């Protein structure tokens, strides 16, 4: 897997790819 | 949260998976 800073929409796309059917939560003010 | 770990800093595949349901 890439070793880079993942921000904004790229971070959301990375979670969609990694999590698959599980889905994910994106909560930036955490 | 995710921004601090994966955008400000760099995350491994394992750390990104902590945000899966
Ligand atoms: Zn971009």
What is the element layout, followed by pairings?
The complex is a heterodimer of chains A (30) and B (21).
Chain A: H1 8-19
Chain B: H1 2-8, H2 13-16
The structure holds zinc ion.
Keyword list:
heterodimer; A: 30 residues; mainly alpha; 1 helix; 40% helix; B: 21 residues; 2 helices; 0% strand; binds zinc ion; hormone; insulin
Task: Briefly say what this structure is.
It is classed as hormone. Chain A has about 30 residues and is mainly alpha-helical.
What does this structure look like?
The complex is a heterodimer of chains A (30) and B (21). Helix content of chain A is 40%, strand content 0%. Chain A has one helix at residues 8-19. Chain B is an all-alpha fold and 21 residues long. Chain B is built from 2 helices and no strands. Chain B has helices spanning 2-8, 13-16. At the A-B interface, helix 1 of A face helix 1 of B. The PDB classes it as hormone. The entry lists the keywords insulin, hormone, glucose metabolism. The assembly is dimeric. The entry is titled "insulin complexed with 4-hydroxybenzamide".
**Fraction in helix of chain A:** 40-55%
Oligomer: heterodimer
The most extensive contact between chains is: A-B, 21 and 16 residues
Structural class of chain B comes to mainly alpha
- Percent strand of chain B equals under 5%
Q: Assign the structural class of chain A, choosing from mainly alpha, mainly beta, alpha/beta, alpha+beta, or little secondary structure.
A: mainly alpha
Terminal CA distance of chain B reads 15 Å
- Number of extended strands of chain B: 0
The total count of strands of chain A amounts to 0
Per the principal axes of the C-alpha atoms, what is the gross shape of chain A?
A: flat
Kindly state the percentage of residues in helix of chain B: 40-55%
Main beta sheet of chain A, described?
none
Which hetero ligands occur in this complex? zinc ion
Total discrete domains of chain A = 1
Q: What series of H and E elements makes up the topology of chain A?
A: H
| Largest pleated sheet of chain B | none
Number of helices of chain B: 2
């Amino acid at each position: 897997f890439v070793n880079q800073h993942l921000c904004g929409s790229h971070l959301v796309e990375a979670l969609y790819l990694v999590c698959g059917e599980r889905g994910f939560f994106y909560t930036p003010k955490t | 949260g995710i921004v601090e770990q994966c955008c400000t800093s760099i995350c491994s595949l394992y750390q990104l998976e902590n945000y899966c349901n």
